[PDB]
Design a protein around this ligand. Sequence first.
Ligand SMILES: Nc1nc2c(ncn2[C@@H]2O[C@H](COP(=O)(O)OP(=O)(O)OP(O)(O)=S)[C@@H](O)[C@H]2O)c(=O)[nH]1
Ligand SMILES: [Cl-]
Length: 443
Amino acid sequence: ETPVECFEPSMLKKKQLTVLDLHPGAGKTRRVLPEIVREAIKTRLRTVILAPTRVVAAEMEEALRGLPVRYMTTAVNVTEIVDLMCHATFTSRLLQPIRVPNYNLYIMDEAHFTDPSSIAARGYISTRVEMGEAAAIFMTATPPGTRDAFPDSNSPIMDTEVEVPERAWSSGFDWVTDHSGKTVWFVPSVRNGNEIAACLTKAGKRVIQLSRKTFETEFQKTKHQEWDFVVTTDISEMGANFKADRVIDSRRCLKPVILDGERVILAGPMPVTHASAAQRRGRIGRNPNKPGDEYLYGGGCAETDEDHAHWLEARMLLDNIYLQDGLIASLYRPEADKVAAIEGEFKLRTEQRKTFVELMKRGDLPVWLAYQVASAGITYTDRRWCFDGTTNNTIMEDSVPAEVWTRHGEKRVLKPRWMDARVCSDHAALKSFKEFAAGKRAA
Ligand SMILES: Nc1nc2c(ncn2[C@@H]2O[C@H](COP(=O)(O)OP(=O)(O)OP(O)(O)=S)[C@@H](O)[C@H]2O)c(=O)[nH]1
Ligand SMILES: [Cl-]
């Protein structure tokens, strides 16, 4: 229950689940993780290590060099004693009709990650631990329920609430561009990031944008002194290391919300959680001999309620991940109260379960949307639902209805039967959903 400040080998005994909240300067990846891994190899424990991103996974692979650790960059079925993969890869593996190894040790890094695949992985793991099959270590500086937006750092951080631009500006924010150092700017969305980055670029700044779809390749560009701003969504809350001296934090996020069980809207921008604010601020103050890092933030914090879609989507995943004796994993208890749904409420019959996973893995659809289409009895290749919805579900592209040529040869207005705002959030999202609706892409 209570987080612990340092690793101790008793945490590796079955039924133990520990939240490890390491102090600044502890060297989690380079010092603590190899100690845990060596002790795991020592006691012949089948172990998996779960990184939030491929960037962190690559950092772990380096830190663990010379140890028998196998890094699985993709969710392909495999079947030397320590596996390494991303949270998302792990959950994708759980969905395959192949049993995942009987790991007796799970190590999850940046275990505060609130994406549905991470929530689902935490529920599966905590269930395996509760059943005496394994031990688990959840590593995070911001465990569930944290209310401290201003935790300790290696060096003191100068915190100041300011007006943070939410749109492009032409004047009135000279403190933004008068800065001569490096700034990480957290924005609530890709579209907002696009508008802010363009404005900084117009002002002569060298900007790198980061988001979930681009993160691995664009994060590489940060590894040099060749930039003035990183403009990033919340994805950089999950262990992204920057050499910066300032964070500009909107303190805002978008929240996917299922309205009346009929549609998903992206509500907000609204205040971030305390954990998110702490992690954003946590990009700086990291050098104990470099004072003066600055955290400029645009508003207050607020805690999630039950209307956030990711926890329902995690239950949709876990209901369709088998265990022995037909068992269904529960959410990790600190998060279980974020949904009203019970284990099994979303468990689909075999053929519709298969379509559900196809829409997610092949179709790149959000979990909620994939579930609506699968549970309606629609097969994966039937794209008619993308066009026969209410006019109220028309997706707009440049202030006119978006239009798609189907592989059958008709031009159709994009009007999905179920509307999930995430498929048309940004240009990259829409482009993908358009290719999906065109029946062109079976991936
Ligand atoms: N390039 C480089 N960076 C280091 C080295 N040791 C620590 N750092 C970086 O200094 C920062 C502060 O270290 P620390 O407080 O221990 O954070 P940490 O997250 O536990 O450190 P780690 O998991 O990345 S090893 C981190 O960003 C860490 O990556 C090092 O040997 N080389
Ligand atoms: Cl993103």
